Design a binder for this molecule. Structure first.
Ligand code: CLA
Ligand code: CLA
Ligand code: CLA
Ligand code: CLA
Ligand SMILES: C=Cc1c(C)c2cc3nc(c4c5[nH]c(cc6nc(cc1[nH]2)C(C)=C6CC)c(C)c5C(=O)[C@@H]4C(=O)OC)[C@@H](CCC(=O)OC/C=C(\C)CCC[C@H](C)CCC[C@H](C)CCCC(C)C)[C@@H]3C
Ligand SMILES: CCCCCCCCCCCCCCCCCC(=O)OC[C@H](CO[C@@H]1O[C@H](CO)[C@H](O)[C@H](O)[C@H]1O)OC(=O)CCCCCCCCCCCCCCCCC
Ligand SMILES: CCCCCCCCCCCCCCCCCC(=O)OC[C@H](CO[C@@H]1O[C@H](CO)[C@H](O)[C@H](O)[C@H]1O)OC(=O)CCCCCCCCCCCCCCCCC
Ligand SMILES: CC1=C(/C=C/C(C)=C/C=C/C(C)=C/C=C/C=C(C)/C=C/C=C(C)/C=C/C2=C(C)CCCC2(C)C)C(C)(C)CCC1
Ligand SMILES: CC1=C(/C=C/C(C)=C/C=C/C(C)=C/C=C/C=C(C)/C=C/C=C(C)/C=C/C2=C(C)CCCC2(C)C)C(C)(C)CCC1
Ligand SMILES: CC1=C(/C=C/C(C)=C/C=C/C(C)=C/C=C/C=C(C)/C=C/C=C(C)/C=C/C2=C(C)CCCC2(C)C)C(C)(C)CCC1
Ligand SMILES: CC1=C(/C=C/C(C)=C/C=C/C(C)=C/C=C/C=C(C)/C=C/C=C(C)/C=C/C2=C(C)CCCC2(C)C)C(C)(C)CCC1
Ligand SMILES: CCCCCCCCCCCCO[C@@H]1O[C@H](CO)[C@@H](O[C@H]2O[C@H](CO)[C@@H](O)[C@H](O)[C@H]2O)[C@H](O)[C@H]1O
Ligand code: OEC
Ligand SMILES: [Cl-]
Ligand SMILES: [Fe+2]
Lengths: 65, 172, 37, 35, 37, 82, 34, 32, 340, 34, 490, 28
């Protein structure tokens, strides 16, 4: 090894290696934002594809100036 | 012709004069070729993926084989085990000999037909001609993709050999 | 606000969840009816 | 052995088996439509 | 400095050389026409 | 070499099987047949009957020309007795 | 028990019949040319 | 200039061919 | 926990392995196959391409197909309940909703299936080279049925699902993109053609280089399902080819990896070529050739010849192949040689 | 004729560079003791 | 030893030399950027932003520098076409300068991290052997990203403490660098509204800052750490690549279809604008308006700004071109010099005819002329043997309004047909073919190339993901398999 | 009109001349 000023100061940030939460930890909470993101994309996708029209949002070079 | 583009010429014109894509023999041909490449990949992968470990983590997995071996270099039982589960057991080979016969039989048989196709359309027994088959209640002609194919063929017919024809029918 | 195509989006977003539902319902159920070891 | 009836294999087999015959029946009928 | 212990030797057999070159050359025979366009 | 399922061979041979399917199979068949023969299929799929591609005189095609008012446009095509 | 070889030759002819009906339909149906 | 380039590569592939057939690594049995 | 119980059930070894993947595969895979079989026999392509496309109309197994949507639709996903069909089913059918249905569904179905290979591989404990390989067919489907038309004006120019309906896709590409002259398509075929060779050649090399392990003529039974010795003389095979072709394998591990490589690489290349045809960035012409053909009227190569075949294909097809363009090409404007 | 000026050098380096690569390896492999 | 295609595995767990490597790469990518810049500056012509803008000169990097502010040269000129402007230090030269240096430094840095590879920071106190706590790393990095993402939208795009971004009207005639105000409403999800690009970076930036912290604190649920073989760097790769190619397929789509991010005055028109006759309609709309306010045909068309007419030319359609048709769009049809003017075709009866335009799909297309109702009135025949509509038999003539040929009329068949043959591509222009020694064969715009390149790389990267991912979930069975014979019995 | 009548019989004939043998069990 070879410690160094910067090296020590950063020593903490990299040390908790294999440290894991137990069981199904935060998984379920995660599986929700995940599903939320999935729906969020489908929306912005379907908006760009003009499948989901929304007065106020005009997906053309127009609506510009 | 003996050349790259010269071959495409042979093809494009052939199609126009014989409508080969619409001939059973050519289709069997592509089944054999597509299939071959397909199977070639199947075998190739199944086998390569079920090789008995005898190599290091940082050593070519190939070295695990010596020219002039007695026993096999892959688990044909593990191979069959995986492939049998992908589709379903009885739809998978376990007999290396039956596997390899199929492996050879398929392409060779298919190409045999493709060769018989060109040898057959060499006497003007061409592909199916479904031009203006489906017609409506009054007699109008209702097009099918078979017709869109005929137009593309006419373009080829009408333009190949610009100056070689002097008469109506292309009998040569 | 809530335009015809917006309503349809919900109809499909709802008609979709249902399918995922009945599917995981049925599955989670039959799964828990046999698997002894 | 004491084999069961309604199984997963059965379901599949029917999802393809049932419609098929229904189509073969449909098509067989078309052979008579005209103009 | 300490002789880094993560290094292994590199190898390319004769057959690989050949298979390699066969590939380079033919690709070159295939793309040169389009390079000169 | 085995799993729970009752070996097809046995089933395709069981007189019970045929006793069931001699009824079921032709059942499904006659159904689909009627599906076509009763003209129902034509309406389930908006597919034209031999006498519904064009109006008597017209020789033009009912080509859908714009996405959003498409359904509406299609309906009108059925109008000219097409 | 219904002998297999019979299940086959029966289900077999049965297919040549339906598939043959299709081939006939080709010179009469709408897929005709007449 | 182009002709030369096409023929050269060709000439190179044929050379390869030669060496590959006549100067391969003799294929050794068992004790490899 | 129910999860591990849900798992337990799924990964249970049945006749037709389900697995987690199946939750995606089977729903889709069946819908794709189903939609095709449905349209092939019931739905028409009249309001879409002015074409009869189903058995119900008179089409046979070759002429039938699930045709693409109108060009008006553009790249619309055409959902059953979207602005187009508006929840209505029959309309959906007539607007070619069944295309994006089969397309998009089958698409997920190829994802599920590859995942399956990956999942089953893991369980059975074998290497996933069957999955790597299957990337090739995904690429083809993805680039051709999705990426391509995504670069064009709309789904209308994607290949329609059907036998003949695919041949026109071929003829089109020749005529408009002069696709046969593309370096990538060539590699493509070199691989598929070359792959169907390894297949045949390796198969025969094995069957005619077998050891005798039985007393019968039909040597099929003479096989040990339970490993042990090599069933064919790898040593004899080597000497055969080494004397008839000059080159010959001698490392079954490589000979088999090669067989994965050749056709998977081929299809990957053929894909890139198409990903380029999306933007119309084709390999249509050779400029040096065109320039000499302009100034000098006696210069003729099998290349120039071909380009004329293309002109004819485009001029005589465009009309009924691109209805939305209301093309009208007077007889006098139609390119044609003498007499024909 | 009327070709591309860089075509020659594009083809030359396309062949040389990777060939030179392989060759460097093969020879350094080939000369490894034992 | 190691096969040629594995030589880089020598880093799989040498955090030191892995950083040394990653440093060198960044150096080359930064280096490339700097010098690709200088190459464009040594060949780009600012003499005319109207008819010879960067996207006609095969400029690829120059546009990405304008989209964010840099629009001037230390030599005095500027992208918009103004003079006397003082870009300050951050001129194209400046940007190019900067990267070249950042590259030199990253180089030196790569060297140091290579020699001093065994820093203790990479060794786990516990096992005393090399190790990197990925989960915490990801949290840290993700924190910095959102922190920077935030700033970019918050200060740069808004103008608070920065230039802004490229913004233009609906027909790329006014474009420039302007401060853009956020937009959290719904229309901010509209690809064509700049406000959305601002809101996004502020919101996503924050969400990014929050989420980072989370990951800096909360640890990975055992279940996952196990499933996604975390603590195995070769999996960080499989996921990143999956993201990188996702990002790629998206940028390729917004470049081809257009968005406030790929502005036409910087990347060129869209194949879709030509398809829907986008600019053709904006012109007419304008011309008919002038006629209403009692102007003459000459006056009406003369009012039409050259720049506008130029977008209505199939020679700027990215869908025309070829894979080996190299160079700028200028090596094709030539450097655009001026607008010859609107061409109106008429036949003996005075009837006004119209030239059927060329669909992008067609390399070559026929000259056909129809009236308002679409009736074929005239054309240029192949076989003259029985031509009914030759320009000769119809007395077709052509007149021009506004532009070089304004007020002139031509009646000698050949000349009329020449122009008719040109009308096919839309507005007729005057090119300088000498200079670049052009060949007259259409080439694609940067918009087109960027799109082709990214759509390929993306599709290629998919394969990398599938490969590396697999190699992570099957590390154990790598090298081969072993024993037992279990298969058909649960 | 419907000589399908023919085929039918000469058709079940082939399988018959082996079936009767499956009954009289012998020489197959
Ligand atoms: C599980 C496998 C599966 C998958 C992946 C798909 C996938 C798809 N289907 Mg198919 N389908 C399936 C099974 C499946 N299907 C089955 C079994 C049937 C027979 C019943 C069908 C019948 C079917 C039809 C009839 C149609 C499709 C269509 C489609 C496509 C788009 C539909 C869509 O927008 O969904 C959106 C996705 C969702 C609803 C998922 C939401 C998930 C989150 C976690 C739930 C949150 C819900 C909550 C209410 C929201 C809170 C937010 C709040 C702000 C309101 C899509 C490719 C359409 C198509 O092909 O178009 C061309 C179409 O018309 N499918
Ligand atoms: C000191 C900082 C720095 C700065 C201010 C610039 C500034 C600039 N660069 Mg340089 N660059 C740098 C470092 C820097 N660079 C380094 C270190 C390299 C080597 C890797 C490069 C390599 C480089 C290249 C190759 C190019 C530039 C270009 C440019 C110019 C255009 C900017 C642009 O459009 O980016 C576009 C930015 C993106 C790619 C978007 C980032 C978003 C990604 C997709 C998200 C990543 C996912 C993230 C982790 C998810 C979590 C986020 C959370 C908030 C949700 C601009 C003048 C361009 C140019 O014009 O050349 C001169 C160009 O082509 N740069
Ligand atoms: C990928 C990103 C990228 C993109 C989109 C562009 C885009 C562009 N460049 Mg830039 N360029 C780049 C990277 C990029 N460049 C890099 C890294 C360099 C440094 C070398 C340059 C150096 C450069 C120069 C010096 C010039 C340009 C020019 C141009 C413009 C003209 C287009 C062209 O020449 O196409 C040409 C495209 C091709 C020939 C196609 C490449 C495809 C090859 C043949 C396939 C290789 C296949 C492979 C062998 C297959 C084997 C596989 C098998 C074994 C499995 C265009 C805007 C020109 C300009 O200034 O415009 C006026 C110009 O003079 N560029
Ligand atoms: C995101 C970046 C990325 C990174 C960091 C890695 C990293 C790695 N790859 Mg992966 N890979 C990627 C993308 C990436 N890959 C993609 C997109 C694909 C699909 C095409 C692959 C396919 C792949 C395979 C098939 C293999 C690896 C292997 C490896 C490992 C060893 C590398 C090596 O020694 O190469 C050796 C390098 C060379 C001497 C040859 C380089 C020659 C190229 C083809 C010529 C073109 C070079 C040119 C400069 C490239 C410009 C870059 C362009 C993207 C802009 C290494 C961990 C190997 C492995 O797993 O080891 C056991 C392995 O077998 N990779
Ligand atoms: C066109 C010819 C061609 C076909 C038809 C084909 C077919 C198939 N290849 C498979 C596998 C493979 N193919 C492989 C390599 C190759 N395959 C090739 C060429 C082909 N491969 C080539 C050239 C290669 C070499 C690169 C590999 C390595 C594998 C496998 O591992 C796999 C296998 O299991 O081997 C036997 C099977 C996957 C089944 C499946 O995913 O079910 C589930 C998904 C379904 C049912 C969805 C289908 C959805 C598609 C996208 C829509 C099709 C639409 C209609 C249903 C079809 C009718 C349309 C036509 C008339 C045009 C399938 C039988
Ligand atoms: C359980 C297992 C079944 C699972 C189903 C899997 C799907 C199998 C493919 C379906 C084939 C469709 C054929 C069909 O229905 O034809 C139905 C058509 C209908 O026939 C039509 O009838 C009339 C329509 O009004 C007209 O007369 C038409 O002109 C036409 O003759 O039959 C044919 O004419 C073709 C003959 C059959 C050819 C099929 C061979 C296919 C080989 C490819 C195998 C795939 C690889
Ligand atoms: C397998 C996957 C492969 C997929 C390929 C993906 C590539 C995407 C395309 C990216 C396009 C960017 C091209 C950059 C090059 C360029 O623009 O120059 C293109 C150059 C220059 O273009 C020039 O532009 C103008 C001058 O400014 C003039 O019009 C010139 O006449 C000329 O056209 O043209 C060529 O010579 C093309 C030949 C390219 C062939 C590559 C040869 C390989 C060289 C290897 C050497 C390695 C050294 C180590
Ligand atoms: C679409 C859809 C759906 C559904 C549906 C389905 C799922 C269906 C299915 C279907 C199916 C699943 C079908 C099938 C059919 C089939 C058929 C019709 C077949 C036929 C066949 C034949 C005819 C054969 C023959 C042969 C061969 C191939 C080979 C050789 C020999 C022989 C001759 C035997 C839903 C509601 C969700 C929604 C909307 C859409
Ligand atoms: C055509 C072109 C191009 C190209 C490029 C190239 C070809 C490049 C190259 C490059 C190179 C080729 C580089 C190099 C580099 C180098 C370096 C980076 C170095 C460094 C060094 C150092 C650091 C040193 C040191 C020292 C000394 C020696 C002395 C004493 C002192 C000192 C210490 C300082 C581009 C892309 C741009 C664009 C387009 C065009
Ligand atoms: C050290 C130092 C320095 C310096 C530095 C320098 C001067 C640098 C440079 C650098 C550079 C100057 C760089 C460059 C780079 C480049 C690159 C890195 C490139 C690349 C390329 C590529 C990769 C390509 C490819 C390709 C081809 C060939 C064709 C086909 C397509 C593609 C695109 C793929 C100073 C004084 C500041 C100070 C401090 C120290
Ligand atoms: C898929 C399959 C199968 C099937 C088969 C079948 C379905 C068959 C059929 C068959 C049949 C169905 C046959 C028939 C036969 C017949 C015969 C061999 C006949 C003969 C005849 C004669 C010789 C006659 C005569 C006559 C008459 C009748 C009347 C008039 C006069 C005269 C005298 C001429 C099997 C199981 C193998 C196994 C594998 C699979
Ligand atoms: C995973 C995702 C799977 C999604 C599967 C959805 C399948 C059903 O999708 C659903 O079909 C019904 C028709 O049967 C549509 O319903 C539509 O037609 C009915 C009449 O038949 C109308 O009363 C309704 O207002 C209209 O929207 C729904 O709008 C659509 O969302
Ligand atoms: Mn080469 Ca067979 Mn088209 Mn007559 Mn010539
Ligand atoms: Cl010819
Ligand atoms: Fe084999």
């Amino acid at each position: 090894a070879r410690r160094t000023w910067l090296g020590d100061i950063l020593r903490p940030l990299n040390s908790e290696y294999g440290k894991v939460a137990p069981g199904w930890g935060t998984t379920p909470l995660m599986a929700v934002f995940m599903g939320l993101f999935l729906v969020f994309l489908l929306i912005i996708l379907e908006i760009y594809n003009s499948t989901l029209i929304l007065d106020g949002v005009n997906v053309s070079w127009k609506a510009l100036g | 012709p003996l050349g790259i583009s010269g071959t495409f010429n042979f093809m494009i014109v052939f199609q126009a004069e014989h409508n080969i894509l619409m001939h059973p023999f050519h289709q069997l041909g592509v089944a054999g070729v597509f299939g071959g490449a397909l199977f070639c990949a199947m075998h190739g992968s199944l086998v390569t993926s079920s090789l008995i470990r005898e190599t290091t983590e940082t050593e070519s997995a190939n070295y695990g084989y010596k020219f002039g071996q007695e026993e096999e270099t892959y688990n044909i039982v593990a191979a069959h085990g995986y492939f049998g589960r992908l589709i379903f057991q009885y739809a998978s080979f376990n007999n290396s000999r039956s596997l390899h016969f199929f492996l050879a039989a398929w392409p060779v048989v298919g190409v045999w037909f493709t060769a018989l196709g060109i040898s057959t359309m060499a006497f003007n027994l061409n592909g199916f001609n479904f031009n203006h088959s489906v017609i409506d209640a009054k007699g109008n002609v209702i097009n099918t993709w078979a017709d869109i194919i005929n137009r593309a063929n006419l373009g080829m017919e009408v333009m190949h050999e610009r100056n070689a024809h002097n008469f109506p029918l292309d009998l040569a | 606000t809530i335009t015809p195509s917006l309503k349809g989006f919900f109809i499909g977003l709802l008609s979709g969840a249902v399918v995922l539902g009945l599917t995981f319902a049925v599955l989670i159920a039959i799964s828990q009816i046999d698997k002894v070891q | 052995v004491s084999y069961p009836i309604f199984t997963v294999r059965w379901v599949a087999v029917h999802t393809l088996a049932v419609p098929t015959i229904f189509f073969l029946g449909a098509i067989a009928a078309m052979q008579f439509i005209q103009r | 400095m300490e002789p880094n212990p993560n290094r292994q030797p590199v190898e390319l057999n004769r057959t690989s050389l050949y298979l390699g070159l066969l590939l380079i050359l033919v690709l070159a025979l295939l793309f040169s026409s389009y390079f000169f366009n | 070499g085995t799993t729970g399922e009752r070996p097809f061979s046995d089933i395709i041979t069981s007189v019970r099987y045929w006793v069931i399917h001699s009824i079921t199979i032709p059942a499904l068949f006659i159904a689909g047949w009627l599906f076509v023969s009763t003209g129902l299929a034509y309406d389930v799929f908006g597919t034209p009957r031999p006498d519904s591609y064009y109006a008597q005189e017209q020789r033009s095609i009912p080509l859908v020309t714009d996405r959003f008012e498409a359904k509406q446009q299609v309906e009108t095509f059925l109008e000219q007795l097409k | 028990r219904i002998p297999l070889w019979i299940v086959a030759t029966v289900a077999g002819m049965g297919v040549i019949v339906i598939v043959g009906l299709f081939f006939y339909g080709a010179y009469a149906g709408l897929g005709s040319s007449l | 200039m182009e002709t030369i380039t096409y023929v050269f590569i060709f000439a190179c592939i044929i050379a390869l061919f030669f060496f590959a057939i006549f100067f391969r690594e003799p294929p050794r049995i068992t004790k490899k | 926990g129910w999860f591990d119980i849900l798992d337990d059930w799924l990964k249970r070894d049945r006749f037709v392995f389900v697995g987690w993947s199946g939750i995606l595969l089977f729903p889709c895979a069946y819908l794709a196959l189903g939609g095709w079989l449905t349209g092939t026999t019931f739905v028409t392509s009249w309001y879409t391409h002015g074409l009869a496309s189903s058995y119900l109309e008179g089409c046979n197994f070759l002429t039938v197909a699930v045709s693409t949507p109108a060009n008006s639709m553009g790249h619309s996903l055409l959902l059953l309940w979207g602005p187009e069909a508006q929840g209505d089913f029959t309309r959906w059918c007539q607007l070619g909703g069944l295309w994006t249905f089969i397309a998009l569904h089958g698409a997920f179905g190829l994802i599920g299936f590859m995942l399956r290979q990956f999942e089953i591989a893991r369980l059975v404990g074998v290497r996933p080279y069957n999955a790597i390989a299957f990337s090739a067919p995904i690429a083809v489907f993805v680039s051709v049925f999705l990426i391509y038309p995504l670069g064009q004006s709309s789904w209308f120019f994607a290949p329609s699902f059907g036998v003949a309906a695919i041949f026109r896709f071929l003829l089109f590409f020749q005529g408009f993109h002069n696709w046969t002259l593309n370096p990538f398509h060539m590699m493509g075929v070199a691989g598929v053609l070359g792959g169907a060779l390894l297949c045949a050649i390796h198969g025969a090399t094995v069957e005619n280089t077998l050891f005798q392990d039985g007393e019968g003529a039909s040597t099929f039974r003479a096989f040990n399902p339970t490993q042990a010795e090599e069933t064919y003389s790898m040593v004899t095979a080597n000497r055969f080819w080494s004397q008839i072709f000059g080159i010959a394998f001698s490392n079954k591990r490589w000979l088999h990896f090669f067989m994965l490589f050749v056709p998977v690489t081929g299809l990957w290349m053929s894909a890139i070529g198409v990903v380029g045809l999306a933007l119309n960035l084709r390999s249509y012409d050779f400029i040096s050739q065109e320039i000499r053909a302009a100034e000098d009227p006696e210069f003729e190569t099998f290349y120039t010849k071909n380009l004329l075949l293309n002109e004819g294909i485009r001029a005589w097809m465009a009309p009924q192949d691109q209805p939305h363009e209301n093309f009208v090409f007077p007889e006098e404007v139609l390119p044609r040689g003498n007499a024909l | 004729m009327e070709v591309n000026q860089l075509g020659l050098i594009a083809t030359a380096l396309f062949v040389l560079v990777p060939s030179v690569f392989l060759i460097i390896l093969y020879v350094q492999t080939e000369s490894q003791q034992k | 030893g190691l096969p040629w295609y594995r030589v880089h595995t020598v880093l799989i767990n040498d955090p030191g030399r892995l950083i040394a490597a990653h440093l060198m790469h960044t150096a080359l990518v930064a280096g490339w950027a700097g010098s690709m810049a200088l190459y464009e500056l040594a060949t780009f012509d600012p003499s005319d932003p109207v008819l010879n803008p960067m996207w006609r000169q095969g400029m690829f990097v120059l546009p990405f520098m304008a989209r964010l502010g840099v629009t001037g040269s230390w030599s005095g000129w500027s992208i918009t076409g103004e003079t006397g402007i003082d870009p300050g230090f951050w001129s194209f030269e400046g940007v190019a300068l900067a990267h070249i240096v950042l590259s030199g430094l990253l180089f030196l840095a790569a060297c140091w991290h290579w020699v001093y590879w065994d820093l203790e920071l990479f060794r786990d106190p516990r096992t005393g052997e090399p190790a990197l706590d990925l989960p915490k790393m990801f949290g840290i990095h993700l924190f910095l990203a959102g922190l920077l993402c935030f700033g970019f939208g918050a200060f740069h795009l808004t103008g608070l403490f920065g230039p802004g971004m490229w913004v233009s009207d609906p027909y790329g005639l006014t474009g420039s660098v302007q401060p853009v105000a956020p937009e959290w409403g719904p229309d901010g999800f509209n690809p064509y509204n700049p406000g959305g690009v601002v809101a996004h970076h502020i919101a996503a930036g924050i969400v990014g800052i929050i989420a980072g912290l989370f990951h800096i604190l909360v640890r990975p649920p055992q279940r996952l750490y196990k499933a996604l073989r975390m603590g195995n760097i070769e999996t960080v790769l499989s996921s990143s690549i999956a993201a990188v190619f996702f990002a790629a397929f998206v940028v390729a789509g917004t470049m081809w279809y257009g968005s406030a991010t790929t502005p036409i005055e910087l990347f060129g028109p869209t194949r879709y604008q030509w398809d829907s006759s986008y600019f053709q309609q904006e012109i007419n709309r304008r011309v008919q308006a002038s006629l209403a306010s009692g102007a003459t045909l000459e006056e009406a068309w003369s009012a039409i700004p050259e720049k506008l007419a130029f977008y209505d030319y199939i020679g700027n359609n990215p869908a025309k071109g070829g894979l080996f048709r190299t160079g700028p769009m200028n090596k094709g049809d030539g450097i655009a010099q001026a607008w010859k003017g609107h061409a109106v075709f008429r036949n003996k009866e005075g009837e006004e005819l119209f030239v059927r335009r060329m669909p992008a799909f067609f390399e070559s297309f026929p000259v056909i002329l129809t009236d308002k109702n679409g009736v074929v009135k005239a054309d240029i025949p192949f076989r003259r043997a029985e031509s009914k509509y030759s320009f000769e038999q119809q007395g077709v003539t052509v007149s021009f309004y506004g532009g070089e040929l304004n007020g002139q009329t031509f009646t000698d068949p050949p000349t009329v047909k020449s122009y008719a043959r040109k009308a096919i591509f839309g507005e007729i222009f005057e090119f300088d073919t000498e200079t670049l020694n052009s060949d007259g064969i259409f080439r694609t715009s940067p918009r087109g190339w960027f799109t082709f390149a990214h759509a390929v790389f993306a599709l290629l990267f998919f394969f990398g993901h599938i490969w590396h991912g697999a190699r992570t979930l099957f590390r154990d069975v790598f090298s081969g398999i072993d024993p037992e014979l279990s298969p058909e019995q649960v | 009109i419907a000589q399908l009548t023919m085929i039918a019989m000469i058709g079940i004939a082939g399988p018959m001349i082996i079936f009767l043998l499956a009954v009289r069990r012998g020489n197959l």
